[PDB]
Amino acid sequence: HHHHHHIEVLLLDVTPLSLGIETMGGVMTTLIAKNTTIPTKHSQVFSTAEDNQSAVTIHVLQGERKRAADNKSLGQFNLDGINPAPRGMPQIEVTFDIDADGILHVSAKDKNSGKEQKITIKANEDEIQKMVRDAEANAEADRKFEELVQTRNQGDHLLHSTRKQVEEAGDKLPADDKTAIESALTALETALKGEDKAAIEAKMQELAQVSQKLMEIAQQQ
Amino acid sequence: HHHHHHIEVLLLDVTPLSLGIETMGGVMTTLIAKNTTIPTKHSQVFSTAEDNQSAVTIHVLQGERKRAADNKSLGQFNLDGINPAPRGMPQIEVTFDIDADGILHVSAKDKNSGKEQKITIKANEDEIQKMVRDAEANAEADRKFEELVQTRNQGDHLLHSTRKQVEEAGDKLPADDKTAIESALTALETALKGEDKAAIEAKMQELAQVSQKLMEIAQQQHA
Ligand SMILES: [Ca+2]
């Protein structure tokens, strides 16, 4: 009683360690997780970290730790030529492609300009298990580090965008709100220098709660 | 910042449940695992399950269970027009793309012909945690099921290639070896209907024990 539309998985190999890139704050962002079946192709879209940034550096990493510096370095390259735009607007697609020969191809492409750059990384046993074990021993500190960096980066963006809004609003912003917002901005700046995720979240919320008039002001444009 | 070549994640959003397709034996094969940051595009190449198969069905699934039937079905489509070839030779690339708006694009492309079909899927917190808890409660049964399917598919491939080798050997195969191989093939066929991975593995080894001359004939023919 057979049917004839079935699809079969081709199982040739799996990756021994995670593969990814370094991102803002010294974090390893994974593109291909440990144990992914190969051949495979994974991409994710990234952006710039400051206004009018013209280039990014892709640092290719191998390992299970969240701090980039605690992983193995496989290679690096730049993608130049990113057209001037606000932080976070350019769309840079980073693709990790592993072929049947086990060769890793990494590329970064600007989705807007089409500019592309790429590298090829050519295809341990006790070192692998050592690295897996080093990660388990630091799993808690690594999670806390990753969450802190994410929170800091979100807080830095909010700091910068809010200051920009204050400047554009000018005399349209009531003095009481401006005082409240400036105080909240300074408090968030101080929190961002620390290592306490909860304090940064609280200062971000305290800032949003006093900044509601900025959005309304922008709309009268 | 003191330096100016930094790269940042575009969004923080992640997928709530794993996304994949149904594969031979009723298994969900994941293309994008749960908690993957978006936008993301993941592709993998699959193939046909029988010789000269001309079409495949892509059944898109969402969830954490290994049996396809235990996950949510999000849609299906066929890719037809596949040129005749041995099982496992056609290269069908399946791509899952989730854009910044959270919209899922699934496509299947025949790498030979460039023929392509696709669907767009537009995508529930208590149901999510429900589905997660049930996958953990059933982790062992699910793994046993997946491992059984993998062993069955291997045994079926072996049944088929051995029968092919026997037909190619013809009169070169001694009658006694042919009998023993036929008997071992029947035993394996019977084991494949069961639910015991070890019995199937044992029948595969027993087949290797009686196929030595068949393999020697096979090698000399390859020569
Ligand atoms: Ca960086």
Curated annotation (Swiss-Prot), chain B:
N6-succinyllysine found at: 122, 144, 203
Superkingdom of the organism of origin: Bacteria
Residues recorded with modification N6-acetyllysine: 41, 172
UniProt-reported outcome of changing residue 75 to D: In dnaK756(TS); confers temperature sensitivity
Observed effect of gene inactivation: Non-essential; synthetic lethality is seen in a triple tig-dnaK-dnaJ disruption, although this depends on temperature (triple disruptions grow slowly at 20 and 34 degrees Celsius but not at all at 43 degrees) and strain background.
Subcellular location: Cytoplasm; Cell inner membrane
Effect of substituting residue 56 to I: In SEG-2; confers temperature sensitivity
Modified how: Autophosphorylated; GrpE inhibits the autophosphorylation.
Assigned protein family: Belongs to the heat shock protein 70 family.
Task performed by this protein: Plays an essential role in the initiation of phage lambda DNA replication, where it acts in an ATP-dependent fashion with the DnaJ protein to release lambda O and P proteins from the preprimosomal complex. DnaK is also involved in chromosomal DNA replication, possibly through an analogous interaction with the DnaA protein. Also participates actively in the response to hyperosmotic shock.
Complexes and interactors: In pull-down experiments interacts with CedA.
Name listed for the protein in its UniProt record: Chaperone protein DnaK
Organism per entry: Escherichia coli (strain K12)
Upper classification of the organism: Bacteria, Pseudomonadati, Pseudomonadota, Gammaproteobacteria, Enterobacterales
Section covered of the full-length record: 389 to 607 of 638
